[PDB]
């Protein structure tokens, strides 16, 4: 057999040569002429030769996890976190194992998501003179929206911006008297502007609430407003806005229609929008030069940015916005109101549906030692090899188990080897200690 063919100088080599291979130090069975190679043999092949069982040495190891931490059942239920260290995303955190040649040790790893993904939201509000009546509803909605964000998740970013109309002779009266204010002398309306960014993304809610109140209404001559033009800048100006690798939500509220490409011909503008950030000092100074972006061109910019768009509008314009909602994918339509229940409900509904992917990273192992990962996922989904490490479509509170097997060919060192196994994007890791012995006990 292979054990006989092992030609082991000592007992330790036998174990190194094979798993079943056993060694007898009595030397009563082994022939004096025959080399210590004959002592090495199958456990059955030794017992058959009459070698004593106690004399025969067959060291093996038993799988035993040194530390075991139970996964949190709550799993941050209803966007509520007890503490960062208190939540556990891995059951077998630290484990200790002994690796013998031909004795692969397999453990079970269970991963449960006890956290909520961070969300970034940007608020865009129309300031035309016709929104003077609805101004109260828009201001109230902002504070309610921020309160929902705190309840929905621990970490969030909130920012807002405003738009009016193109600074052109046709759209806004060019008369010097109305240049200062288009509203009647009794009122004190501000000058018209294409896009004005009042606040960049920030983590403080209190600053966001106070800024919304100070906003003052502006007025233009035509019924439709340039809302599409304002969205283009926000989508492409990642630097100024402060966009990060986090789910992005855009809220747009208007009580008037939207101009589309080819509507700038009357003004005298014929250059199509290039979708390039032209914001200067947190303002848009090239509104006149570029024509309003088309729906087809506008959709492409949002898809590349992967920014979800939510529109809050009045009941009268609802029938028009619904047709647009059918066109743009991953978008929803809401009705602006004093109550503002529908606008808040859509955000919470959107947040509830989120699918993520969890992968497993393992530390380098010794030569002749390999590891196999067997993934288990929702709907009986089971991967193998590389596919068997990653799991996708996992919602919050969903737990998936993973079967890991470690096999040792030979023993590189006498001392144990500790390596850390943590999934990408998660601080929590899995430490596995592997001790291999080539000398018979």
């Amino acid at each position, epitope marked *: 057999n292979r054990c006989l063919k092992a030609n082991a100088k000592s007992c330790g080599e036998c174990i190194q040569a094979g798993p079943n291979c056993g060694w007898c130090t009595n030397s009563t069975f082994l022939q004096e002429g025959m080399p210590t190679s004959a002592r090495c043999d199958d456990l059955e092949a030794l017992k058959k030769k009459g070698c004593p069982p106690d004399d025969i040495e067959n060291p093996r190891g038993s799988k035993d996890i040194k530390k075991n931490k139970n996964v949190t059942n709550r799993s941050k239920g209803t966007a509520e976190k007890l503490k960062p260290e208190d939540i556990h995303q891995i059951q077998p955190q630290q484990l200790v194992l002994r690796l013998r040649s031909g004795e692969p040790q397999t453990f079970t790893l269970k991963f449960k998501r006890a956290e909520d993904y961070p969300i970034d939201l940007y608020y865009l509000m129309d300031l035309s003179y016709s929104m003077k009546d609805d101004l109260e509803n828009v201001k109230s909605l902002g504070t309610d929206l921020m309160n929902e964000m705190r309840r929905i998740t621990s970490d969030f970013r909130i920012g807002f911006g405003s738009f009016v109309e193109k600074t052109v002779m046709p759209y806004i009266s060019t008369t010097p008297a109305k240049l200062r204010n288009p509203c009647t002398s009794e009122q004190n309306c501000t000058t018209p502007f294409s896009y004005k960014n009042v606040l*960049s993304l920030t983590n*403080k809610g*209190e600053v966001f609430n106070e800024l919304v109140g100070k906003q003052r209404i502006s007025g233009n001559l035509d019924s439709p407003e340039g809302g599409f033009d304002a969205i283009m800048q926000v989508a492409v100006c990642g630097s100024l806005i402060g966009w990060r690798n986090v789910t992005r939500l855009l809220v747009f509220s208007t009580d008037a229609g939207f101009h589309f490409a080819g509507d700038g011909k009357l003004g005298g503008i014929v250059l199509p929008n290039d979708g390039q950030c032209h914001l200067e000092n947190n303002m848009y100074t090239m509104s006149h030069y570029y024509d309003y972006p088309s729906i087809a061109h506008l959709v492409q910019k949002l898809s590349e940015n992967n920014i979800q768009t939510i529109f809050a509008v009045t009941e009268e314009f609802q029938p028009v916005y619904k047709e647009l909602k059918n066109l743009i994918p991953k978008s929803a339509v809401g009705t602006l109101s004093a109550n503002s229940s529908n606008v808040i409900q859509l955000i919470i509904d959107a947040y509830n549906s989120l699918s993520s992917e969890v992968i497993l990273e393992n530390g380098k192992l010794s030569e002749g030692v390999t590891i196999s990962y067997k993934s288990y996922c929702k709907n009986g989904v089971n991967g193998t090899g590389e596919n068997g490490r990653k799991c996708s479509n996992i919602s919050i509170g969903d737990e998936v188990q993973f079967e890991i097997s470690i096999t040792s060919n030979k023993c590189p060192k006498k001392d144990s080897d500790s390596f850390k196994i943590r999934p990408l994007g998660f601080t929590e890791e899995v430490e596995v200690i592997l001790q291999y012995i080539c000398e018979c006990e």
Partner: antibody
Framework: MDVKLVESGGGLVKPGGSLKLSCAAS????????MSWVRQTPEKRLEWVAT????????YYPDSVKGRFTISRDKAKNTLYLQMGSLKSEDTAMYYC?????????????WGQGTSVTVCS | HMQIVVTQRPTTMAASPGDKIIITCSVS???????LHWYSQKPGFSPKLLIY???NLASGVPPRFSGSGSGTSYSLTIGTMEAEDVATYYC?????????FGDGTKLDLKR
């Protein structure tokens, strides 16, 4: 510029003592601009102790000194007050009175002379 | 409780007059350019805001000083080093609470 900030009342404090710091703002409307307290340590590092809004509706405090200090303002006297209680050895530093020119940028544009408060064992 | 971490690459350095000095600032998480600020402090004097919004020099600041960057990378560049330019420079980010100031670079005159 043309903004005068003066901090007075700094003194040696025993561990667990209470020290009150008063900041005077002149040449500008104190209520209109948000005010904050910044202290420089003996390693020449900068740590932000507190931030108070112009309205006075809300305030911001760091975790280390959070819940152990108090910040308030007096519109009538145009004076900023920092109340310190249960002071430790780490607390000794050079405290400065600041003024945030724009809330959106959240950048400090004015810095006071400052008063040194050193804990004594 | 997640806190932004500010890092300044040259903790201490010394250069001859007319030399070009470049100091960087690393942020742990993505922030907006307007939030980032730079502060310069002379010895025996209180800190003064040299540049605001990373692209604007505070009134009373010489033209040589310049700022540029985006995302998590920033830098303060001095075209010509001068005896007055000798001070401690700190890059502070006010995007999120708490507000954190990175260790100031003790740039001084060599020999």
């Amino acid at each position: 510029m043309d903004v005068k900030l003066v901090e007075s009342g700094g003194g040696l404090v025993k561990p667990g003592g209470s020290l009150k710091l008063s900041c005077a703002a002149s040449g500008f409307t104190f209520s209109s601009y948000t005010m904050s307290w910044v202290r420089q340590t003996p390693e020449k590092r900068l740590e932000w102790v507190a931030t108070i809004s112009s309205g006075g509706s809300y305030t911001y405090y760091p975790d280390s000194v959070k819940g152990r200090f108090t910040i308030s303002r007096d519109k009538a006297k145009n004076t900023l007050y920092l109340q310190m209680g249960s002071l430790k050895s780490e607390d000794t530093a050079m405290y400065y009175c600041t003024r945030i020119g724009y809330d959106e940028d959240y950048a400090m544009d004015h810095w006071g002379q400052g008063t040194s408060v050193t804990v004594c064992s | 409780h997640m806190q932004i971490v500010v890092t300044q690459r040259p903790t201490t350095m010394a250069a001859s007059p007319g030399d070009k000095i470049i100091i960087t600032c690393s942020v742990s998480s993505i922030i907006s350019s307007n939030y980032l600020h730079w502060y310069s402090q002379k010895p025996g004097f209180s800190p003064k805001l040299l540049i605001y919004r990373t692209s604007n020099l505070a009134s009373g600041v010489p033209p040589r000083f310049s700022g540029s960057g985006s995302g998590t990378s920033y830098s303060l560049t001095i075209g010509t080093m001068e005896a007055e330019d000798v001070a401690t420079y700190y890059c502070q980010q006010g995007s999120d609470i708490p507000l954190t100031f990175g260790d100031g670079t003790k740039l001084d005159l060599k020999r």
